[PDB]
Design a protein around this nucleic acid. Sequence first.
DNA 1: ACAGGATGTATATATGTGACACGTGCCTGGAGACTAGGGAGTAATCCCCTTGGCGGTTAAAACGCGGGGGACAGCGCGTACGTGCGTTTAAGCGGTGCTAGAGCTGTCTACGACCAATTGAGCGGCCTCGGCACCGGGATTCTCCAG
Length: 49
Amino acid sequence: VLEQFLTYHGHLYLRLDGSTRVEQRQALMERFNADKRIFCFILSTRSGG
DNA sequence: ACAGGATGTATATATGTGACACGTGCCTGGAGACTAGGGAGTAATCCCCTTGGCGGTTAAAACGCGGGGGACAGCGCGTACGTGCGTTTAAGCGGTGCTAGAGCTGTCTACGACCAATTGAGCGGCCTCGGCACCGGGATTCTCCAG
């Protein structure tokens, strides 16, 4: 529902959940901390610490 | 060819089992009045858990694939089992015809059952620590080509 809300307003994002693979997690991290277009980085609180 | 006797044969009638329905009597239910004890019905304790949602990590499943070696059918064929048959063996369907031996009735004890004591198993509660359970090798011993 957070993504459903962010879409209605038009906000780029790259979600992150425990179900994501560590490879995908690292790829998303590298693509977010490098690309300035993405405005949000939705993730879980108690994910990989 | 026929008129009547000399045998059959289903047909109809009075007599043998069985099983239901009835009719008496005598046990077994029913009816009643006491006296627990059992069980219901809260009211307290001690467990040790409780659930949702979610992130993480490792092995048990889950899946792919090859391939082999088994599961099936067909073929054949040779006992071998059913199918008649003629024989004969012995079940059995009624009988007679004793006797053990159930089944009972009665009698009368030893033998349980409470039962109130008495008390020592036995049960829980801790403590301890050998004994299995797992590591780590190191031999051995199967399995599988591969000749």
